[PDB]
Design a binder for this molecule. Structure first.
Ligand SMILES: O=C(N[C@H]1COC(=O)[C@@H](NC(=O)c2cccc(O)c2O)COC(=O)[C@@H](NC(=O)c2cccc(O)c2O)COC1=O)c1cccc(O)c1O
Ligand SMILES: O=C(N[C@H]1COC(=O)[C@@H](NC(=O)c2cccc(O)c2O)COC(=O)[C@@H](NC(=O)c2cccc(O)c2O)COC1=O)c1cccc(O)c1O
Ligand SMILES: [Fe+3]
Length: 296
């Protein structure tokens, strides 16, 4: 039989007696993947409504419409609340290990309400994460279907586009802060670009970020002099940004000497690409096609 089944965490192996039917996600990031495979996620943590990466509820933009259609409940905005979770009467609770949406501090408390699992999204492809969530929820078939849909579009996409100059740097840029976070090869963003045939730029020395003690594997912070130093690719991709962000880079005196700037190879991928799940991955495909189709 399919249930019960054991799922192993960083906190050991746990028993899911039966298929979850009321999943609460304390990670707004994880929620996108849950929705993509039609898992019964009935409530989610949210970030700040109408901020750079979220909709009017604090949900991530790429699955905003889906959450509204399904009447997804919002647990809280920003600060995690164990009582809010309890009130949803979950039979499974998910927590992200890293990121601003991690409710890891409430692990012990949440653990008393329902079986509770800790998931990393900082160190694996969106497909890997989807597959893992499929095992957790009993929606393996759905996860495989979503991945197959993408694989078909990818096979066509790789044929349809001509790559810009390599290697490339992928970031999230914060214009008024004159800073960026640089996506690593391990990050979902990095793995996706590699899958599409891109080579990520190697970093200078002094650039390397501790990821001991379970610290995140997805980004390297670029503040101060590290900004110009870290944007060293021949092309530059801005996730979670659109044209005004690319134009801000093109106009920044601090960055004027960089090759991606001087060769006009700075590309915005969209505000809905802060986190990668099936929905935003498909968007990234479409955008790369719009930018790089041979015939353009
Ligand atoms: O100080 C922290 N945020 C700031 C400052 O961080 C930022 O300026 C940007 N941010 C990254 O570039 C980033 C690139 C790659 C990965 C990132 O996570 C980025 O944050 C944009 O983030 C934001 O727009 C918002 N962001 C989310 O809603 C979010 C939703 C779900 C999950 C999140 O992690 C979110 O940020 C609001 O957050 C913030 O602005 C902060 C500290 C410690 C660890 C954090 O993760 C922080 O975010
Ligand atoms: O680009 C925007 N800002 C700039 C310029 O804003 C600011 O420099 C500061 N901040 C205010 O001055 C502010 C005064 C009055 C009101 C403010 O909201 C201020 O933030 C510091 O904020 C931060 O550095 C970062 N950000 C958070 O960590 C955050 C974490 C939790 C919650 C936050 O709001 C955060 O900003 C990066 O943000 C930016 O630097 C920007 C865009 C879209 C929506 C935004 O909210 C932005 O601020
Ligand atoms: Fe964050």
């Amino acid at each position: 039989a399919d249930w019960p089944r054991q799922i192993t965490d960083s906190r050991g192996t746990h028993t899911l007696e039966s298929q979850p039917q009321r999943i609460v996600s304390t990670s707004v990031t994880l929620t996108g993947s849950l929705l993509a495979i039609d898992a019964p996620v009935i409530a989610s943590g949210a970030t700040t409504p109408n901020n750079r990466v979220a909709d009017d509820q604090g949900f991530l933009r790429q699955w905003s419409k889906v959450a509204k259609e399904r009447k997804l409940q919002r647990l809280y905005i920003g600060e995690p609340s164990a009582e809010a979770v309890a009130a949803q009467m979950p039979d499974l609770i998910l927590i992200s290990a890293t990121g601003g949406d991690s409710a890891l501090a409430l692990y012990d408390q949440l653990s008393t309400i329902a079986p509770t699992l800790i998931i990393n999204y900082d160190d694996k492809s969106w497909q890997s994460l989807l597959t893992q969530l499929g095992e957790i929820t009993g929606h393996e078939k759905q996860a495989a279907e979503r991945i197959a849909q993408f694989d078909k579009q990818l096979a066509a996409a790789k044929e349809q586009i001509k790559l810009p100059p390599q290697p490339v740097t992928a970031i999230v840029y914060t214009a008024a802060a004159h800073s960026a976070n640089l996506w690593t090869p391990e990050s979902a963003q990095g793995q996706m670009l590699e899958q599409l045939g891109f080579t990520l730029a190697k970093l200078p020395a002094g650039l390397n970020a501790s990821q001991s003690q379970g610290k995140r594997h997805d980004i390297i912070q670029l503040g101060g002099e590290n900004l110009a130093a870290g944007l060293n690719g021949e092309s530059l991709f801005l996730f979670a940004g659109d044209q005004k962000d690319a134009d801000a880079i093109y106009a920044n005196p601090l960055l004027a000497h960089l090759p991606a700037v001087q060769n006009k190879q700075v590309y915005a991928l969209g505000t809905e690409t802060f986190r990668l799940d099936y929905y935003s991955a498909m968007q990234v495909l479409d955008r790369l096609k719009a930018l790089f189709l041979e015939h353009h």
